[PDB]
Every structure is written in structure tokens, then in C-alpha cells.
């Protein structure tokens, strides 16, 4: 930077998609409860189909 000699970084650029200094509650994280419940009910479906 033109005016700050201590301001530098590496090539690594990125971001966390979080809310208010927290750990990111991702799109998969908010859909993973309903995917785990879909796997449990379709298990009951498959044993009902079989018998």
C-alpha cells in the first residue's frame, strides 16, 4: 500500500459467508436436517414396500 509499510498479505484471498463474527451457517447446513429426515422416512417406505 502506498502509505502503510506494514500493510501486506499473501496471495490467498477469500471470505467466510457468516453472520456477525460467527461460524458460517451454510446452505447445506440449513438443509441437512431435512435431508437426514428424508433418509429416515424413505427407509420406512422401503421396508413397507418390501414386506
Amino acid at each position: 500500500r502506498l502509505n502503510n509499510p506494514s500493510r501486506c498479505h499473501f496471495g490467498i484471498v477469500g471470505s467466510i459467508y457468516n453472520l456477525n463474527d460467527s461460524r458460517p451457517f451454510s446452505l447445506v447446513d440449513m438443509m441437512k436436517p431435512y435431508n437426514y429426515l428424508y433418509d429416515a422416512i424413505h427407509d420406512r417406505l422401503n421396508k413397507a414396500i418390501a414386506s
Binding site: 422401503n46 421396508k47 414396500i49 418390501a50 414386506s51
Partner: protein
């Protein structure tokens, strides 16, 4: 069946009958005949001994073992493939397939000319004497005792030596225990309800268990994860 079939001799049924002073003229000879009528009329396949014998078929005919009572399956010896049943009316008869068998007496009638076959069958368990051996099940023993008490009292009622209320009680009590004895021998154990569970719950239905000796019948059906 939940309980195991421990074998006892026929005179153990006579300690129980001769506790009744009207059944004191009973014999082993009468206990032998009334047991075999009772064993037959119940038709419990747990009372019989499973045997397997290989016999050779000469020309669509083979000689059956002497102790045979009911065939479980007949199969071929070299293949293991099982034989179903002869529905042909003109079987070994020429004019001018899937193999089969047919049994009438001590002769089996197959569809194959010159072949050895395994026969899995049921016989009666015998003693050191050539006499029947009965389960020690106090449900079996009680209702065999009530069977003989009902056949002896039926004779005595025809003679006029028994009240009609006495025979009606014996006919009722045999009638209850005969269903309790049927359910005692038929209703599966925990280990037979597991094989019944695996046959019943099948996503890809297994419909050819007769070709084997029903070997893979109670096997569990597995599905891969994908």
C-alpha cells in the same frame, strides 16, 4: 415349535391313564394303536424324524425306503435340482421336460429313466423295541391321554356304562387341549420367526425356493447402498 422334542417311551402315557380307575383295563397294545391314530390326526411335522436316502431309479421307478411316511422333497443326485410332481396321465408310456415324481406304495414313479435321486422324508422314531416314541411335552402327553380317555369313554357310552354328562366333559376337554397342542407345535420359535421374517421382507422377491431344498428360504435379503 418353541420347546425341544425330548423323547419318552409309550408306557409313560399309561402312568397317567391308570390314575383314572375307569381306565384300568388299558394296555400297551391299546396305547400303541390310539397313539398312532392321535399322531396321525394331529399331523404335527415335528413329531417325525427327518431322513434323507439316495435311491436309484431303474426305469421311471424306484423302491422307496421301508420307514417312509411322508416325502419332504425328491431331488436329483447329480444336479441337486428338485422334482415337482407328476401331472402327466401317460408318463412312462410311449407313443408310436421338467422332471417329476409320483409315489403310491413302496414305489416312486419318476420322469427320469436311469438316475439316482435323493429323497428327504419323514419317519416315525422307534425304540430299542420296534415301537413308537412320543414327546415328553406335558401338553402333548395330556392331550394324548385325553384322546385315549375319549375313545375309551365313547365305547363305554355306547355300552351304557358312562353318563352322557361324563362323555360331554371328556369330549370338551379333549377339544380344548387338541387346539392348545396344535398351537404348541405349530407356532414358531424366535429362531423360526427370523427365517419367516427374512422370507416375508424381500424387496426383490425370491420365488424359486423349491429348486433348492428351501435352503435359502429364510436367508436375509441384502440391498447395496448407492
Amino acid at each position: 415349535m418353541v420347546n425341544n422334542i425330548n423323547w419318552v417311551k409309550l408306557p409313560v402315557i399309561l402312568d397317567r391313564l391308570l390314575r383314572h380307575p375307569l381306565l384300568t383295563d388299558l394296555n400297551l397294545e391299546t396305547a400303541i394303536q390310539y397313539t398312532l391314530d392321535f399322531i396321525s390326526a394331529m399331523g404335527l411335522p415335528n413329531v417325525y424324524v427327518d431322513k434323507i436316502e439316495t435311491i436309484d431309479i431303474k426305469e421311471y421307478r424306484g423302491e422307496l425306503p421301508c420307514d417312509l411316511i411322508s416325502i419332504n422333497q425328491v431331488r436329483l443326485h447329480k444336479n441337486g435340482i428338485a422334482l415337482r410332481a407328476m401331472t402327466d396321465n401317460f408318463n412312462a408310456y410311449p407313443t408310436h421336460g421338467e422332471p417329476s415324481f409320483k409315489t403310491q406304495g413302496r414305489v416312486i414313479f419318476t420322469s427320469i429313466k436311469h438316475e439316482k435321486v435323493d429323497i428327504s422324508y419323514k419317519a416315525i422314531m422307534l425304540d430299542d423295541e420296534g415301537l413308537p416314541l412320543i414327546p415328553d411335552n406335558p401338553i402333548f402327553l395330556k392331550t394324548l391321554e385325553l384322546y385315549i380317555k375319549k375313545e375309551w369313554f365313547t365305547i363305554l357310552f355306547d355300552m351304557g356304562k358312562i353318563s352322557p354328562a361324563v362323555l360331554n366333559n371328556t369330549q370338551q376337554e379333549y377339544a380344548f387341549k387338541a387346539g392348545q397342542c396344535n398351537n404348541e407345535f405349530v407356532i414358531p420359535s424366535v429362531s423360526e420367526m427370523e427365517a419367516i421374517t427374512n422370507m416375508w421382507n424381500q424387496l426383490i422377491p425370491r420365488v424359486t425356493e423349491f429348486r433348492r431344498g428351501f435352503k435359502n428360504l429364510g436367508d436375509k435379503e441384502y440391498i447395496r447402498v448407492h
